[PDB]
Structures are given as C-alpha cells and as structure tokens.
Design a protein around this ligand. Structure first.
Ligand SMILES: COc1ccc(CNc2nc(N(CCO)CCO)nc3c2ncn3C(C)C)cc1
Ligand SMILES: [Mg+2]
Ligand SMILES: [Zn+2]
Length: 290
C-alpha cells in the first residue's frame, strides 16, 4: 500500500450533492487529485455499482488510483482530468439527464469504466482505431491487475458482456468512427424511428453517448470552456488569430448535431445542448472581431 491509497481508502466520501457531480456545469479546476478520486467513488456508489456488483472498498480505491496513474500528467489535455471530466459528464447524463433508466446495470457499469479509461496512456495528439485499441488494452490490463479487480463480483457471463461493452465504448471514442456511424443515428431520430429496445440501436446509442461525454468540455460555462480550449491549444501546438473560427468550425461539424440528437432522446440533457449553443455564440462574436 502506498501513502496515497491509505489516505484515499480512509477518507469519508461526501455526497453527490456536496461534490456537485450531478451538475452539467461541473469543473475540476479547484479539486486536488484526492478530491477527484473521492468524486469517482461517489459516482460508482450512487449508480449503485458498488452494491450491485459487490466491490470491495480498497479494491475500487486501488483501481481508481491505478487508472489515474496511467494517464500522463505532462500531456496538456489528454490526461486524468479529461478522463475524470468525461466520467462526470456520464454520471450527470445518467442522473440529471435521466439516461439511467433507459439502460441496464451492466451497461452503466461498462459506460462508467469506459469513460474513465478511454484515453489511458495518451501521449498527446502530436505524439506518434489504433489509439483506442491501445486505450482498451491498458484498461483491461488494470482491470486484471492484482488488487484492482473491480469486476470480480460479476459472474463470467456478466463479465464477458461487460468487457465487450467496455471495448465498444472505448472504440467509439475514435472520432472517425463517430463520423461514420452518426449519420444512421441522426437518420433514425429524424424519422421518429429511434428505439432502444433494438440491440443494434442500443449499441449505437451507447457509442453516441460516449462521444457526447468525451466532447462535453464544449458545453461548459464560457470561463471553463475557454480554459479547456487553452489546454487543447497547448497540446495541439506546444505539444490565436484563427482560433475562434476554428472553435466555431469544430462546434458545427462535430458537436451541435450530437447534443441536439441526445436532447431528442432525453429532454433532460438539454443543458448540454444549451451550453454548446452559448459557447458557439461567444466564439462566433470573437471570430467576427478576427
Ligand atoms: C491549435 O488550436 C486549436 C484550436 C481549435 C481546435 C478545434 N477545437 C477543438 N476543441 C476541443 N475541445 C473543446 C475546447 O477547445 C475539447 C473537447 O470538446 N477538442 C478538439 C478540438 N479539435 C479537436 N479536438 C479533439 C481533442 C476532440 C483545435 C486546435
Ligand atoms: Mg481518445
Ligand atoms: Zn477523450
């Protein structure tokens, strides 16, 4: 046991309300590493995954700290804080967005693990679905490491189902796969034909939800979103004239239709769409002052 595991395992976990993890506007800038770990325990707990799958407290704690350690702190955007935020967006969409009741327990378990694990060992966009296969391999390696086996409570049939959902969810975070598959999702939604009871559409919806969470910095209150956009710029460049129009371009091409679609699946996800619209206005106004 390290010092960090001792302290995390012994801490009280504040409630979801106290931690503000149910809010689509959540920000981690003021949180220490230990506080993000406690937030992550609270997500597992309030989705009832600790109960329903009999996770030992110290095992969940070691797993969370192994995940965190296998992100690189030296990478400006694709690091533990991005993974932590993606998972918090998943938690908020499940709870405040009322997605929880559309999904099975095994799907929710797989979505939360995938959210936290989907960029593992990223070295920055400039450093040379190959990447997402590697993120999944890292995720599996951690799930199988001694003392980290948070899925040990599942039966082998549950285990196999969950692992395959995790893998598809992490593979879905490849934006090239999102662009190839979203047309079918938009098509089903515009024809009022979308139906989650169909396995094929369910898997499609889980893929889209992963992308919505992965991108969700774009939905945050403008001061937060501006700061996150700075991290992205740092990673893309360090490893400003045209940035506003590039942001508008990314919002239109990638984000707006996804959050509109998800609001059609669940009206309680509207704050994501609303936040993305408000950011597009701010960036456009700046783009017009070139
Ligand atoms: C050189 O400077 C710039 C300027 C603009 C862009 C375009 N905007 C992009 N913004 C963001 N985020 C929003 C805040 O910027 C984080 C996720 O929402 N992710 C992106 C972008 N382009 C690619 N990705 C991936 C990392 C998903 C790029 C690089
Ligand atoms: Mg990725
Ligand atoms: Zn990501």
């Amino acid at each position: 046991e390290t010092r960090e595991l001792q302290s995390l395992a012994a801490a009280v976990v504040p409630s979801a309300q106290t931690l503000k993890i149910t809010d689509f506007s959540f920000s981690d800038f003021e949180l220490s590493d230990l506080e993000t770990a406690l937030c992550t325990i609270r997500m597992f707990t309030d989705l009832n995954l600790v109960q329903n799958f009999q996770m030992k407290h110290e095992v969940l704690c070691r797993w969370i700290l192994s995940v965190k350690k296998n992100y690189r702190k030296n990478v400006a955007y694709h690091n533990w804080r991005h993974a932590f935020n993606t998972a918090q967006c998943m938690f908020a969409a499940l709870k405040a967005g009322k997605i929880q009741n559309k999904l099975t327990d095994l799907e929710i378990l797989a979505l939360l693990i995938a959210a936290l694990s989907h960029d593992l060992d990223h070295r920055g966009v400039n450093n040379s679905s190959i990447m997402e296969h590697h993120h999944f391999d890292q995720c599996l390696m951690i799930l199988n490491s001694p003392g980290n086996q948070i899925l040990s409570g599942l039966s082998i049939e549950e285990y196999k189902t969950t692992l395959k959902i995790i893998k598809q969810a992490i593979l879905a975070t490849d934006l090239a796969l999102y662009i190839k598959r979203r047309g079918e999702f938009f098509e089903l939604i515009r024809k009022n034909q979308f139906n989650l009871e169909d396995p094929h559409q369910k898997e499609l919806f889980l893929a889209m939800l992963m992308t919505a969470c992965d991108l969700s910095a774009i939905t945050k209150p403008w001061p937060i979103q501006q700061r996150i956009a700075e991290l992205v710029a740092t990673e893309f460049f360090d490893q400003k004239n045209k940035i506003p129009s590039m942001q508008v371009g990314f919002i239109d091409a990638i984000c707006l239709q996804l959050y509109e679609a998800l609001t059609h699946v669940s009206e309680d996800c509207f704050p994501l769409l609303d936040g993305c619209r408000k950011n597009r206005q701010k960036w456009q106004a700046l783009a017009e002052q070139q």
